[PDB]
Amino acid sequence: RFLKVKNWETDVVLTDTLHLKSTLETGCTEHICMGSIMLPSVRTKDQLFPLAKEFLDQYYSSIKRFGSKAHMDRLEEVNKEIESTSTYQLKDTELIYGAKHAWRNASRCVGRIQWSKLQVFDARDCTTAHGMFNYICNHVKYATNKGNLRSAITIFPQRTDGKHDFRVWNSQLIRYAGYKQPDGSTLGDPANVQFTEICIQQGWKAPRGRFDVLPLLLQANGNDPELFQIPPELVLEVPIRHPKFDWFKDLGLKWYGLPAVSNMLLEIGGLEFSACPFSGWYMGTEIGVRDYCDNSRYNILEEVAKKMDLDMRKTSSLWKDQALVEINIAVLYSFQSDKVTIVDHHSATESFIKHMENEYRCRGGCPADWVWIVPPMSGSITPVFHQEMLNYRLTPSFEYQPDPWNTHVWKG
Amino acid sequence: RFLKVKNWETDVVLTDTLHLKSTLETGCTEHICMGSIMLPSTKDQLFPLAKEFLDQYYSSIKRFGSKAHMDRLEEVNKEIESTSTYQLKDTELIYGAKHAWRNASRCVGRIQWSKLQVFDARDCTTAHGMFNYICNHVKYATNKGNLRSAITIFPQRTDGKHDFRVWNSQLIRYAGYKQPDGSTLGDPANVQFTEICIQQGWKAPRGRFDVLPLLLQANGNDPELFQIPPELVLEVPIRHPKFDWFKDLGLKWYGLPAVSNMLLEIGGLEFSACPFSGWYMGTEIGVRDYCDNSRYNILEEVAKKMDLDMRKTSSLWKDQALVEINIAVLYSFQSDKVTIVDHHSATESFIKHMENEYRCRGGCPADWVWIVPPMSGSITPVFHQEMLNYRLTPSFEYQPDPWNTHVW
Numbered sequence: 140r141f142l143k144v145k146n147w148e149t150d151v152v153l154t155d156t157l158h159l160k161s162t163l164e165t166g167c168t169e170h171i172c173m174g175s176i177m178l179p180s181v182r183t184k185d186q187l188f189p190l191a192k193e194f195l196d197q198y199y200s201s202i203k204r205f206g207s208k209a210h211m212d213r214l215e216e217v218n219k220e221i222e223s224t225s226t227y228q229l230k231d232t233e234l235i236y237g238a239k240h241a242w243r244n245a246s247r248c249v250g251r252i253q254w255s256k257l258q259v260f261d262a263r264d265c266t267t268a269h270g271m272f273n274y275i276c277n278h279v280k281y282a283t284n285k286g287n288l289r290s291a292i293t294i295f296p297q298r299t300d301g302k303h304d305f306r307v308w309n310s311q312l313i314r315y316a317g318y319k320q321p322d323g324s325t326l327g328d329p330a331n332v333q334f335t336e337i338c339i340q341q342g343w344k345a346p347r348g349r350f351d352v353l354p355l356l357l358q359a360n361g362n363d364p365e366l367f368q369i370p371p372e373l374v375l376e377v378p379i380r381h382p383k384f385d386w387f388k389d390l391g392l393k394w395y396g397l398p399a400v401s402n403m404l405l406e407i408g409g410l411e412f413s414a415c416p417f418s419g420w421y422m423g424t425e426i427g428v429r430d431y432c433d434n435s436r437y438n439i440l441e442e443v444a445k446k447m448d449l450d451m452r453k454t455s456s457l458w459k460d461q462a463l464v465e466i467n468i469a470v471l472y473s474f475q476s477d478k479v480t481i482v483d484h485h486s487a488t489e490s491f492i493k494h495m496e497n498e499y500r501c502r503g504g505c506p507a508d509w510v511w512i513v514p515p516m517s518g519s520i521t522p523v524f525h526q527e528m529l530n531y532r533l534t535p536s537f538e539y540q541p542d543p544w545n546t547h548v549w550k551g
Numbered sequence: 552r553f554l555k556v557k558n559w560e561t562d563v564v565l566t567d568t569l570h571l572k573s574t575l576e577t578g579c580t581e582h583i584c585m586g587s588i589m590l591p592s593t594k595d596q597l598f599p600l601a602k603e604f605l606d607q608y609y610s611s612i613k614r615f616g617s618k619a620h621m622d623r624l625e626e627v628n629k630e631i632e633s634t635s636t637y638q639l640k641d642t643e644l645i646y647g648a649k650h651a652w653r654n655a656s657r658c659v660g661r662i663q664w665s666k667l668q669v670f671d672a673r674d675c676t677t678a679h680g681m682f683n684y685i686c687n688h689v690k691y692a693t694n695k696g697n698l699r700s701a702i703t704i705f706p707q708r709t710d711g712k713h714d715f716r717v718w719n720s721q722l723i724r725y726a727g728y729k730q731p732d733g734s735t736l737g738d739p740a741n742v743q744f745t746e747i748c749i750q751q752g753w754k755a756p757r758g759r760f761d762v763l764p765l766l767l768q769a770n771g772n773d774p775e776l777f778q779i780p781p782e783l784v785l786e787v788p789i790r791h792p793k794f795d796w797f798k799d800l801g802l803k804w805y806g807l808p809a810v811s812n813m814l815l816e817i818g819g820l821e822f823s824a825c826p827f828s829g830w831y832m833g834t835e836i837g838v839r840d841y842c843d844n845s846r847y848n849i850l851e852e853v854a855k856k857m858d859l860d861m862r863k864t865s866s867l868w869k870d871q872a873l874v875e876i877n878i879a880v881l882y883s884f885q886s887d888k889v890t891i892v893d894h895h896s897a898t899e900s901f902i903k904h905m906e907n908e909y910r911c912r913g914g915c916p917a918d919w920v921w922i923v924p925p926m927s928g929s930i931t932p933v934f935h936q937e938m939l940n941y942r943l944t945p946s947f948e949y950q951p952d953p954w955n956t957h958v959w
């Protein structure tokens with residue numbers, strides 16, 4: 140099977156063969172496309188060895204040692220380990236290759252040109268929540284690099300029986316608290332209200348401001364999670380100002396420099412890494428469009444357009460669009476002036492298309508989820524909008540997992 | 552089989568049961584999603600398709616299983632057995648046309664679906680007759696700027712040798728010409744079609760906004776050329792409410808969007824010439840027509856005139872210029888009293904429509920990749936709305952351009 144994608148701006152046609160290695164499910168059928176649905180709609184030995192073998196065959200192919208003595212010995216070694224212990228341990232080299240590939244395969248990620256430059260911190264020797272905290276502080280400090288951001292992932296011990304899971308309960312390492320007020324308003328980030336309530340319940344003394352960095356809630360080996368405050372000196376933040384509008388700074392906005400997803404599961408060779416926080420750097424629109432301008436987030440559009448004195452009587456003046464652009468200008472300018480790494484959506488999508496073409500040429504394809512790849516403003520003036528994409532699942536992979544407060548068996 | 556969609560901005564969850572009535576193919580499989588791929592990657596079959604449609608028709612008028620329902624099914628079976636096809640009643644034709652729009656998963660404007668004026672042109676026999684039908688459609692739909700939705704339906708496919716086709720992709724579009732320079736004058740989307748028109752004898756004005764002639768095929772005959780009366784083509788010069796220099800770009804656009812190359816399938820019958828029209832959403836002109844690189848591509852010129860810093864993408868000069876172009880489009884149409892809708896207002900109405908459809912029909916097939924506007928996506932309410940895309944009949948479908956099919 141050869142599948143073709145077309146770019147409607149350039150007429151460039153690419154051929155995908157890589158989808159032949161695809162697995163599991165998109166959620167779609169011939170009757171229904173689930174392409175805009177956000178989420179999907181204790182492993183046993185017999186399913187495990189095949190998954191292991193397929194990963195190790197990929198790994199050995201990549202190092203040009205396929206079918207070598209080392210390859211065959213490693214398959215043997217893993218087979219026996221699975222028979223005797225019901226699981227197996229990855230070599231450090233396989234772990235690194237796996238984590239890099241999970242990012243390479245991440246179909247919703249526009250930043251994948253960067254995939255081969257990922258710093259992998261092996262935290263599989265970690266045993267306690269205090270140990271997790273120390274690993275996470277080191278990750279934050281290394282990745283932040285005083286504003287010169289470096290991609291990184293920290294990998295805690297894999298799942299065993301599903302009763303001893305390592306989990307970071309935070310959805311990201313750094314996020315701001317949100318507090319629901321008795322009057323139904325929200326102080327801080329509305330996205331984080333439920334998690335904030337949990338932290339408070341667990342004993343966090345909330346400052347109750349608009350930009351309070353949440354504590355880490357960390358679970359090791361299936362134990363009840365424990366609270367830790369990231370040292371404030373490790374959390375780099377950027378005050379948001381605008382290059383022409385001197386009132387913009389008095390909106391009192393700021394954001395943190397380090398985007399670091401901590402609630403996803405990393406699958407490599409059938410093993411499940413339930414705590415694997417990873418971080419990169421922001422594309423400006425994640426802050427300027429989503430974080431600031433979503434109605435269910437900080438929701439600043441009206442306030443900004445008021446200060447710009449836009450005609451807000453009718454949507455057809457495009458006041459929302461005008462304010463949206465100025466806010467995004469402000470984020471890019473603020474990060475750049477403070478020398479904190481950031482990429483604009485024109486640059487990131489241009490780089491993504493170059494990456495994608497390269498992957499089709501060298502790898503036979505690049506699974507990509509258009510719904511997520513196309514930026515949330517100015518979509519069609521970016522080169523990804525007119526690019527046909529094919530979405531499919533390759534492993535190693537990152538996956539969603541249930542929020543741990545829903546499934547954790549409390550010890551007491 | 553029993554599906555939920557969530558709106559991530561409002562937490563509203565809706566249940567889709569309508570997808571149980573879905574058909575043909577999406578192009579997707581369990582291994583691979585083709586959501587962002589633009590195109591699809593006899594007597595025996597006809598009666599089931601007719602029955603399926605007539606059952607839905609009789610249900611819709613609260614007469615399912617009635618003698619009249621059974622007699623009609625009977626009548627149609629007889630007709631197919633004897634003539635190899637059948638003819639739709641006028642009521643069935645109107646219902647099918649309206650539902651083909653209701654089912655159009657890529658259309659954000661479907662709140663309007665029941666207010667569609669259907670012009671029955673099944674008695675048309677010649678290209679000259681087609682031309683008269685289309686002028687009337689144009690004049691009716693335009694209505695001096697107070698635009699009204701309409702479709703004109705020419706005779707159905709028979710043996711596929713006698714197709715009615717409008718060769719134009721829209722009833723009104725601008726010519727495109729490749730220049731000795733190597734650049735393109737006019738609309739680059741229309742270069743190939745313009746060439747065909749020239750080959751067929753059209754005397755080309757060779758300007759930037761030349762309204763293309765119609766190329767009309769009746770009864771599978773060779774297509775013939777007609778000029779739409781200039782006075783029936785309403786156009787709007789584009790100016791900006793604040794930038795005085797904007798009008799000096801010399802931009803204009805036509806008021807009537809009218810798709811003419813699709814195929815209407817109703818109860819297994821295929822209407823290959825079925826031009827349909829509505830009114831524009833502003834971004835269709837301001838973002839796609841003006842700002843696509845392969846279209847009029849004016850972003851750089853507008854940015855220059857605004858004196859923005861064009862040295863680095865991160866100044867967002869492209870985004871600023873995009874917004875201003877789109878303000879101008881809306882302002883110009885509004886000032887000339889030509890119906891237009893902005894993307895905020897259109898997407899808000901679609902969400903209202905979609906909730907109605909879930910409530911009253913059990914769903915609303917929608918293609919997110921097409922429904923989300925091409926600028927400011929996430930500040931419109933459709934961005935956060937999960938959608939399910941599936942194919943219901945009656946339907947509009949792509950068909951091959953006829954210059955690849957037609958034997959002269």
Ligand code: HEM
Pocket residue numbers: 238242245247248249250251253257290291292417418419420421422425429482487511537
């Ligand atoms: C290096 C700079 C990076 C940039 C500019 C970038 C950009 C982005 C953006 C804009 C999104 C969509 C976010 C949203 O829609 O809210 C995303 C998603 C994602 N990225 Fe990246 N990314 C980067 C690095 C990374 C790294 C280091 C990894 C993992 C090792 C990663 C894996 C992912 C995954 C798994 C998703 C999907 C998340 C989900 O489904 O919720 N990215 N990326």
Ligand code: HEM
Pocket residue numbers: 652655657658659660661663667700701702827828829830831832835839892897921947
């Ligand atoms: C009356 C106001 C209407 C509005 C504002 C509107 C809006 C739109 C828009 C914005 C698109 C996508 C255009 C693009 O991406 O270039 C679209 C697609 C479409 N619409 Fe509408 N529409 C309207 C009326 C109609 C009518 C009257 C019909 C048929 C009777 C129709 C059927 C379709 C179909 C079949 C598509 C997809 C065409 C394709 O796949 O190329 N719409 N609509």
Ligand SMILES: Cc1cc(N)nc(CCCCCc2cc(C)cc(N)n2)c1
Pocket residue numbers: 250310311398399400401402403417418419420421422425
């Ligand atoms: C809180 C949260 C968790 C999660 N799994 N997914 C989301 C939506 C996608 C977030 C991805 C953010 C991101 C992550 C990285 C690594 C870089 C970058 N520029 N941006 C949010």
Ligand SMILES: Cc1cc(N)nc(CCCCCc2cc(C)cc(N)n2)c1
Pocket residue numbers: 163164165179246404406411530531532533536537538539540541
């Ligand atoms: C296109 C696509 C890519 C991808 N990485 N993931 C998906 C969703 C697959 C959902 C089921 C797989 C799964 C789910 C969970 C919870 C764990 C695990 N190891 N695997 C789709």
Ligand SMILES: Cc1cc(N)nc(CCCCCc2cc(C)cc(N)n2)c1
Pocket residue numbers: 660720721808809810811812813827828829830831832835
């Ligand atoms: C030239 C052309 C033909 C075609 N089938 N499809 C396209 C892309 C979609 C065009 C639909 C434009 C439209 C059509 C209608 C009826 C109303 C409205 N506001 N906009 C372009």
Ligand SMILES: Cc1cc(N)nc(CCCCCc2cc(C)cc(N)n2)c1
Pocket residue numbers: 575576577591656814816821940941942943946947948949950951
């Ligand atoms: C989701 C979806 C909706 C829709 N209306 N159409 C499709 C494409 C399915 C292929 C349609 C097959 C077909 C093709 C032709 C040429 C005519 C005709 N009556 N039917 C997908």
Ligand SMILES: C[C@H](O)[C@H](O)[C@H]1CNc2nc(N)[nH]c(=O)c2N1
Pocket residue numbers: 147524525526527528587588589920921922923
């Ligand atoms: C590849 C991509 O699907 C293609 O360019 C689509 C994307 N979304 C679109 N959406 C609309 N409304 N109109 C279009 O023409 C397109 N083009």
Ligand SMILES: C[C@H](O)[C@H](O)[C@H]1CNc2nc(N)[nH]c(=O)c2N1
Pocket residue numbers: 175176177510511512513559934935936937938
């Ligand atoms: C329903 C819809 O798919 C959902 O809101 C998605 C749409 N596309 C997105 N794209 C990105 N990059 N991030 C998102 O959070 C979303 N949300």
Ligand SMILES: [Cl-]
Pocket residue numbers: 428429433515929
């Ligand atoms: Cl968003």
Ligand SMILES: [Cl-]
Pocket residue numbers: 429433
């Ligand atoms: Cl979002």
Ligand SMILES: [Cl-]
Pocket residue numbers: 519838839840843925
């Ligand atoms: Cl476009």
Ligand SMILES: [Cl-]
Pocket residue numbers: 839843
């Ligand atoms: Cl387009």
Ligand SMILES: [Zn+2]
Pocket residue numbers: 429433929935
């Ligand atoms: Zn959002």
Ligand SMILES: [Zn+2]
Pocket residue numbers: 165167171172173174579580583584585586
């Ligand atoms: Zn799909």
Ligand SMILES: [Zn+2]
Pocket residue numbers: 519525839843
């Ligand atoms: Zn376009």
